[model samples]
Target chain A: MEGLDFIKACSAIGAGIAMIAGVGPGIGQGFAAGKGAEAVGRQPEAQSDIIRTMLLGAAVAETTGIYGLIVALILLFANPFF
Target chain B: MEGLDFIKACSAIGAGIAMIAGVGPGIGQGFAAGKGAEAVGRQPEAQSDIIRTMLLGAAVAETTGIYGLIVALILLFANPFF
Candidate 1:
């Protein structure tokens, strides 16, 4: 019973830790959006190009968030440590 | 002793996990910087505008990293688990 209690506590803590990755996408996507807007505002004529570049860069940035999410999901659903 | 040791281990893991949030802002801000540079290259005349927007966005993106750091700090210095 004591061992089970310890495992549960660890798992709960781990789950919370995993969700910490959510911070990445929130900030990253917001930055990309802001840049895209600024580019469009400055070069109205180059809207398409500016947007494309911003989106492309943003997509690259998103990879870190995705990795975080993957780790979180694994911790929640299939944590090998437990 | 074992209980205290376990809590310390959890705190260590939690601190490490919280730092993972830095990955998001890091990638996102890097992308924003790249796009800002590209935009400036295309329209040197709009350097001020591009930089202003980029910085603003990057600052916003920085929040996630800050959050991660705060969480890590909390885990290290004032962890409820400990």
Candidate 2:
């Protein structure tokens, strides 16, 4: 196989691999949402504060997935290797 | 193996692997829904707020799975490797 073809195939695999990082944010945020819901149930009066905190924390967890997306997009459309 | 055949197989694998990201979202959303239901049951008056917060946070989590889908679709139909 030609070198370019080999590299391109590898990049495709790399893009897919990068996307695997998405798994973390989903689980993390979901857990946050669940815990937030529980907290609200435990103290309905503090719903707003609990939600804000949960939202903030979930947003932070989201960065990992976004990083994966960025890396995948770069590999697919703007691959340095290519 | 022939270069085209090899590249095609890799793309297929990559697409399949990308879809694996859906796992996290499914688990997370399920957990969020479960907790949201529990909260609503515990505090019927705060149902709206709890549900809204849960939905909003779950929506954020969904992005990761969507990103994976995009990569998978691109690999399957618009593979740069090909």
Candidate 3:
């Protein structure tokens, strides 16, 4: 069997790759948040509805980010290739 | 079970590779959406038309994201070489 070094290397690689998904949610959510905040500012009375819809859209956009995280987690915890 | 171990190992790599495509559209559309929200908040009366126009432009920008998703899906499933 290969030395345990393979484990560390593989996990490290997994973490890096996993981070790729973060781009989507980070940008998407941030964008949504900005929009929501502005909308709330426009019509102060409609804060609840605006924020709710905005967040919901962000959740929808964040699909791939979660996918990346899941894969990364699997690679880190369940990876046997190492 | 022909090379199942190796096959699975390859799958993780494919997933990671695929997610890279997602980064482009994630940020692109997110920025667009944020701008739309911000713009609409300021011009109350123009909110509807302004949002629609921005959304249209934003949707155009969002095409890249859809393309990325297709590419990712292909990389994961029918990928010849991920």
Candidate 4:
């Protein structure tokens, strides 16, 4: 491949790798959502607290996925290196 | 010929992409476990309830990693794509 084409291909590949972060939040938040649903089904009285606590944990888990998103975006949209 | 190398390369790429899902369950389960442990330390009396919620959420979170594992396995062993 030519230099420019090689760079483009690499950038696109890296972007796809960066998006692997999607897997994390998909698993984490989905799990948290399950617990939220579980609270409604099992701990009706504590459902509100369960939601808050579950949301809190999910908030923490969202950080890395955001980093991946930013990395992917920079690779695709604002890269100066490639 | 495109070469069998191309298909092998794609399978490796697909497997890697699927493995990215491990990130989700990693952080997700870690947080859930932390809260569960904290709950135990703070509320020894609330053992069953704490474990119940934690297990529920963690169980759901684990699926993402499992899905990743399965996809990776399929790509490695029986890939249909190049």
Candidate 5:
């Protein structure tokens, strides 16, 4: 029982730590946002279309960040080890 | 028995650590997304081509993030060290 408890505690810690992966996506998306603005400034006529392209790509980049979040959530809420 | 328990705990930690790899692809893809937007803004007529290129590059970058997620999942659910 103690062993199981310790493992669970460690898993909780691990899950919390896994969220660190979100940082990269945050930074990356911010970069995309900045570039998107710059592009809009360069070509004001294509602003809407540029935003669409930027959004699409940022969404694609978001996949991995979500993966990490899912993994972390699994470890916490649906822990298979137990 | 204790040794095995300890290994499981460590595996959980390892699983969390593995997700950190997702950061690189996120950042890289975001950069690609930004560039794609910039290209489209500059050459509105080439919007589709620029989007295709950006999506392709982002897809390639996504591979590593998936790999990290797979490894993390494996460590947590199908831990071989046991």
Candidate 6:
């Protein structure tokens, strides 16, 4: 298949594989949003605190997705193996 | 030199990608737990209902993570692409 072809194929596959990580952040962030809504619904008075906590936790969850994105980008443009 | 190497590399990359899905459920579930705690704190009497709801939703959120794991396992053990 030659070197370039093999590397290209690997990069293509790697990029696709990297996207699979999206599932995590999607579900996690959605759950956070839902919880935030629920918290606000129940304790209208504590909306600020609830939002603050929810955002903080949700932001933490976002790190994984960002990692995945970095990997995906690397696979596509800066693959070390290639 | 051989297709097996390519396939193996693909599987390895796929497995890593699949595990990335774990981030979603972890973050999502954590948020749900935090919200549940807050809800319980606010209204101790509704603890059961709040807990049940949170768990139920979190279970739904877990689907994506499980799917990712299944894909990762398949890549490791029975990759069709291989």
TM-score of chain A for the candidates in order shown: 0.77, 0.90, 0.80, 0.84, 0.92, 0.88
Give each candidate's interface RMSD in Å. Answer: 4.9, 1.5, 4.7, 6.5, 1.2, 4.9
- Candidate 3 docking category? acceptable
Q: Model 3, which residues run further than 4 Å from truth?
A: A1-8, A80-82, B1-14, B28-82
Model 5, CA-based lDDT: 0.86
- The CAPRI quality class of candidate 2 comes to medium
Sort the candidates on TM-score, descending order: 5, 2, 1, 6, 3, 4
Candidate 4: fraction of native contacts reproduced: 0.17
Docking class of 1: incorrect
Task: Give residue B8's lDDT in candidate 3 (0 to 100).
Answer: 43
lDDT of each: 0.64, 0.86, 0.60, 0.62, 0.86, 0.65
Ranking by DockQ: 5, 2, 3, 6, 1, 4
Against the true structure, what is each candidate's TM-score? 0.63, 0.90, 0.59, 0.56, 0.94, 0.60
**Which residue pairs show collisions in model 6?**
A24-B24
TM-score of 2: 0.90
Considering only N, C-alpha and C atoms within 3 Å, which residue pairs clash in candidate 4? A24-B24
Model 5 / residue A20 / CA error / Å: 1.1
Fnat for each model: 0.24, 0.68, 0.32, 0.17, 0.72, 0.24
For residues A36-81, write the lDDT of model 1, one tens digit per residue.
Answer: 7457556767866776686577667656655655564454456566
Best-fitting candidate, scored by DockQ: 5
Which consecutive 10 residues in model 6 chain A have the weakest lDDT in total? A73-82
TM-score-superior candidate, 4 or 6: 6
Off by over 4 Å in 2: none
Candidate 5 error regions (>4 Å): none
Residue pair clashes in candidate 2: none
lDDT of 5 by residue, B1-82 (tens): 4888788877888888888888988899889988998899999999898899888877888888888898998998888887
For model 6 chain B, where is the 10-residue window of minimal lDDT?
A: B73-82
Tens-digit lDDT track of model 2 for B1-82 = 6688777888888888888889898889899999999888888988877887788878888989999999989988888766
